Design a protein around this ligand. Structure first.
Ligand SMILES: *[C@@H]1O[C@H](CO)[C@@H](O)[C@H](O)[C@H]1NC(C)=O
Lengths: 49, 50
């Protein structure tokens, strides 16, 4: 930067620009049946659960 | 007042199904258990059952 105690820089034109910003909002709504995942259709295993 | 998740369901078992190949013969366990001579432990005999 060409710094000085009496020199300033003033822009003479401008450029309009468009920027893209991506942010997550939601998440996949999962649902797990705990009894089914541990052991399916087993009454003896469900009794131990 | 609200929505509530409950237990998973599946249809109850109605009967038992057994599906085996239609084999009729019996392997001779008589020559294994009622055998006359038994081999030694250093020359143990192996018999295939199928
Ligand atoms: C083997 O010996 C037992 C004991 O007497 C007898 O009951 C059985 O019938 C015998 N089996 C054969 C195939 O001889």
């Amino acid at each position: 930067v060409a710094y000085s105690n009496n020199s300033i820089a003033i822009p003479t034109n401008f450029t309009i620009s468009v920027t893209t910003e991506i942010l997550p909002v939601s998440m996949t709504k999962t649902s797990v049946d705990c009894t089914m995942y541990i052991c399916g259709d087993s009454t003896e295993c469900s009794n131990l659960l | 007042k609200g929505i509530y998740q409950t237990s998973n369901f599946r249809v109850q078992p109605t009967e038992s199904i057994v599906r085996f190949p239609n084999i009729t013969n019996l392997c001779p366990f008589g020559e294994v258990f009622n055998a006359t001579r038994f081999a030694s432990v250093y020359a143990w005999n192996r018999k295939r059952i199928s």
